[PDB]
């Protein structure tokens, strides 16, 4: 049944190398949903962080439309191996390294709805670049992003839009996943830019990372403040008490050195 | 089955010489599928109770494309999980306490997917961290107290103990630090270090106050110095005993 449907679609003259038709010659609108699973290996030296995520794309290809709402055919059919459909040449502008997961079956899912709507889901492991600034160490805040755009097709052919409902979905325990930071807000914005080759539509999900101030407080700031205060009480001691003032002065300084290390 | 590992960050198959897969087709049509896989799974860990902590890591397993209507995963009835002979000792840092096979079937925006979950429970080797850090700091604090029982006039006696004890305390702290992974949140090991560091520091500062008021040579003050020493012999052991009760009852879980 399902295999018979897929066959009927690709028996006709179909070319996955050809952009899907549009009602008014406009661009193909790809609706994008993003699922963030893990954030890990944040590096301030190499200005990068590792993120694993599930990408969900959706567009309309009237060539793949095989049915109406009120027919005996299944609403959507899972695309089997050996059949290629046109897919957005989407990529990640700020990705330095990236892998797909291929253990057993590769982790992709393609659904072809009856009206011709295509759902594309894929698990991706990224290592994105994230320039960080530590002038306010450790009470600083960092913002890392995941840019998403098309490589070959310009604005006349493809246009990216964040999904209307819940564009970004974090995993259950993502905020606690980070040892160093605590993410307060995530945002989905557009980063469409004009380049020398043309105007390319682009999406940008941004995560904001704040560092834990509580540690540094009780590990550095609080003990050092008390240390400076202790150094003062040598002033209230008499001059003749050499063992008292010499000890306090040296002891306090030696302890401070240990703190810095 | 289009099975995969939801919480896998990196994964490889073993292909040396011939690939390491095995497929048996029984007469009734039952298929047996065996494969060697090397995983690198994500396991969020928490070190608030350092090092008296416990970690639980998991191996999620599910289908990617097929919903509950096409495929359903079930753990084998007899011996679902099999550990290798010396697996629990293989880990240098931890000691495996429990293994469990559970279901993690979840409902997502794309559908309801059947899922399995193997879980391992990890306990850290506490005997080293117990005996190599807790014991010497305990002895160090004890040694620092006997300077209260020493006379004010024995400057070489009290000055030595105060400074020597503190220097040894720093060295112990440094040794524990390398082993300890860098983490931004406060750990149990940090609390117990900072406390012992303070108790020894205050014991030395106490001497400075005592040596000061004694030196001013008038008997109201002359004798007060001893009074300071007397209350120190009681205050410090009580405060330290109070701390231990508070500490171990907090990081006893």
């Amino acid at each position, epitope marked *: 049944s399902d295999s018979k449907i897929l066959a009927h679609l690709f028996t006709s003259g179909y070319d996955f190398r050809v952009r899907p038709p549009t009602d008014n010659g406009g661009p193909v609108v790809v609706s994008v949903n993003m699922l963030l699973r893990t954030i890990s290996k944040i590096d301030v030296v190499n200005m990068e962080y590792s993120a694993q995520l599930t990408l969900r794309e959706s567009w309309i290809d009237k060539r793949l439309s095989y049915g109406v709402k009120g027919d005996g055919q299944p609403d959507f059919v899972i695309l089997t191996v050996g059949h290629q459909i046109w897919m957005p040449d989407t990529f990640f502008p700020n990705e330095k390294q990236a892998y797909k997961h291929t253990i057993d079956k590769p982790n992709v899912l393609i659904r072809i709805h009856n009206d011709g709507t295509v759902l594309y889901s894929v698990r991706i492991s990224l290592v994105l670049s994230c320039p960080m600034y530590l002038q306010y160490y450790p009470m600083d805040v960092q913002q890392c992003s995941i840019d998403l755009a098309s490589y070959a097709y310009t604005t006349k052919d493809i246009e990216y839009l964040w999904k209307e409902h819940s564009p970004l*979905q974090l995993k259950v325990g993502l905020s606690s996943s980070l040892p160093s930071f605590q993410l307060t807000n995530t945002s989905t914005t557009y980063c469409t830019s004009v380049t020398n080759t043309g105007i390319y539509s682009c999406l940008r999900t941004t995560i904001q990372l704040k560092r834990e101030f509580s540690f540094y407080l009780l590990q550095l700031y609080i003990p050092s403040c008390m240390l400076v205060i202790v150094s003062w009480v040598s002033f209230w001691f008499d001059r003749t008490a050499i063992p008292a003032r010499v000890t306090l002065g040296v002891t306090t300084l030696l302890t401070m050195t240990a703190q810095s290390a | 089955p289009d099975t995969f590992f939801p919480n896998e960050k990196q994964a490889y198959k073993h292909t040396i010489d011939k690939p390491n897969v095995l497929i048996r087709i029984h007469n009734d049509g039952t298929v047996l599928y065996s494969v060697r896989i090397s995983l690198v799974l994500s396991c969020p860990m928490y070190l608030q109770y350092y090092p008296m902590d416990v970690q639980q890591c998991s191996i999620d397993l599910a289908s990617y494309a097929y919903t*509950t209507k096409d495929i359903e995963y079930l753990w084998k009835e007899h011996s679902p999980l099999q550990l290798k002979v010396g697996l629990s000792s293989s880990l240098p840092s931890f000691q495996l306490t429990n293994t469990s096979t559970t*279901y993690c079937t979840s*409902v997502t*925006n794309t559908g309801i997917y059947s899922c399995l979950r193997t879980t391992i429970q990890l306990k850290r080797e506490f005997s080293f961290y117990l005996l190599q850090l807790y014991i010497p700091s305990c002895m160090l604090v004890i040694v620092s107290w006997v300077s209260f029982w020493f006379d004010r006039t024995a400057i070489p006696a009290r000055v030595t103990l105060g400074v020597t004890t503190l220097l040894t305390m720093t060295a112990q702290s440094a040794g524990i630090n390398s082993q300890l992974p860098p983490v931004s949140y406060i750990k149990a090991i940090d609390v117990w270090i900072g406390a012992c560091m303070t108790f020894i520091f205050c014991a030395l500062l106490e001497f400075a106050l005592v040596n000061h008021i004694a030196n001013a040579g008038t008997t109201e003050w002359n004798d007060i110095s001893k009074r300071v020493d007397l209350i120190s012999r009681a205050l410090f052991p009580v405060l330290f005993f109070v701390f231990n009760i508070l500490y171990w009852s907090r990081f006893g879980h």
Partner: antibody
Amino acid sequence: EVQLQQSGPELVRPGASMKISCKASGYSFTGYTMNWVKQSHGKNLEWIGLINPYNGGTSYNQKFKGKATLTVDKSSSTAYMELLSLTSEDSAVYYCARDGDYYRYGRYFDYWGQGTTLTVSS
Amino acid sequence: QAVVTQESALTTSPGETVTLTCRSSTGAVTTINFANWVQEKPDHLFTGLIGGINNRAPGVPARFSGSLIGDKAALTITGAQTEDEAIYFCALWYSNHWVFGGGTKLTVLG
């Protein structure tokens, strides 16, 4: 203890559409998925749909494709069910039943609501 | 597409043991049917009892116990009580589906 207080009884005319609420309390709302069961007189208990408060993901019965719509407001810890194109057949008592497992579909009913009586007559 | 069948009604005495069955029309009730048992007190009160793989709802008495006797699901009450007198519904999980049964009207003679 936990509670699942639903909306009060409603009375509407055929063609209209109303929405039943189900306010949760006593637990982490986003951790347990909610079911919806329809109890009519003529027919047995009919399971409608389920919805995950966290994902927002839904799974409906083929019988109620388009008849029911499950939503969720995480802030007020409430699950909603909108019934469209109401007829005399939709006159029944509707329950919301919680799933029993924490942040996973355990496929077993935990707690139920007091029920919401929907009467649709012309 | 599929109908779940229960007994009309059963009668038992307090302290004794009664077993309610739950037959599927498509065949034998396997483990992938995830037999659920729901109790209906009067005045439209409902609470879950035993469900899914081997799960039990919080607060469900130890006298309640599930199994797969024969080729159908079973809900056995060992040591019936006065308050155990109610209507018990069994629900079976068909792939992408749920189906409740007619329900058994259990009577505990008080």
